[PDB]
Amino acid sequence: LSKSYINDKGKEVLVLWGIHHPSTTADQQSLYQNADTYVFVGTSRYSKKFKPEIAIRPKVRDQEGRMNYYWTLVEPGDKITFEATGNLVVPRYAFAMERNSGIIISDTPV
Amino acid sequence: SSVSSFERFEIFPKTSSWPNHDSNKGVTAACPHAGAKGFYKNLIWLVKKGNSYPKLSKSYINDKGKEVLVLWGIHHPSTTADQQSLYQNADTYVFVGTSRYSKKFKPEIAIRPKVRDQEGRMNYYWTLVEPGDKITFEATGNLVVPRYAFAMERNSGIIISDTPV
Amino acid sequence: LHLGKCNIAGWILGNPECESLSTASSWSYIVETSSSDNGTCYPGDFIDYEELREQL
């Protein structure tokens, strides 16, 4: 995989992806056919290295695997870069945002 | 720092837990029991039993109504000759997995400065076990398996002093 | 922005049980519920998740 995106807007672009962690080694070759996989995400500010671990996790919601989700910001004028050979969850939509607040857990109507 | 329901129980009994792994040869001179060679009390230093090392796979279901604290260690040997003499495995990896966390451990074999006549290191880690969660250990070497667990339930810090009790 | 029964991780990742949702062009705060269990339908370790809840 080799994808990129040039920020043609006048605001920050938020990109979310995921790193798949399969349970067994038989599930790695049945879904990606690659043992030694690596995921790279690189911007003008950050260059991260991702390495998925294949091990037996406890059964949560009838799933023996995990999936770590990551995120970064894209400056206006910066070009994001994706380069991976497996276990990459590519994004479909982006969240163009611009700000200068938190979370509320409640059951009140709107 | 503030535990009101402490119960020091044995998570893995030393009788019939690891029959294929030696739990007595893993001693050191820096941790003396009564002048002779020894190792930690709440930790078990597994070493090479014979000429190989079987794969470890242990688990524990939380059957109590409180949190269970589990401490383990990741051994970092000094030289590559000490890696094969104690574990007989070059590419080793340690996995610790719960319902909330799944960590990856990779020991580094390099020459450390001599501290307390020991050229090696041992990184200690910890996690919590929820009531109903099952811990998972899976490693092929350099794993310090726990002997006792600390069942705890809280809602304080540390004091360094020389005052009596 | 009100997400209903889904939390932030069910909205930023696109959980299929939160399809009936009309996201506005601007908001000031995000509202979760106490029974927000229909978020990450697949388990995992969301690294740097607490900073993403303040950015959006």
TrEMBL record, chain C:
Parent-protein start and end of this portion: 67 to 122 of 566
Cellular localization per UniProt: Host apical cell membrane; Virion membrane
Quaternary structure and partners: Homotrimer of disulfide-linked HA1-HA2. Interacts with human CACNA1C.
Biological source species: Influenza A virus
This protein's name: Hemagglutinin
UniProt PTM: In natural infection, inactive HA is matured into HA1 and HA2 outside the cell by one or more trypsin-like, arginine-specific endoprotease secreted by the bronchial epithelial cells. One identified protease that may be involved in this process is secreted in lungs by club cells. Palmitoylated.
S-S bridge residues: 6-18
Described function: Binds to sialic acid-containing receptors on the cell surface, bringing about the attachment of the virus particle to the cell. This attachment induces virion internalization either through clathrin-dependent endocytosis or through clathrin- and caveolin-independent pathway. Plays a major role in the determination of host range restriction and virulence. Class I viral fusion protein. Responsible for penetration of the virus into the cell cytoplasm by mediating the fusion of the membrane of the endocytosed virus particle with the endosomal membrane. Binds to sialic acid-containing receptors on the cell surface, bringing about the attachment of the virus particle to the cell. This attachment induces virion internalization of about two third of the virus particles through clathrin-dependent endocytosis and about one third through a clathrin- and caveolin-independent pathway. Plays a major role in the determination of host range restriction and virulence. Class I viral fusion protein.
Family: Belongs to the influenza viruses hemagglutinin family.
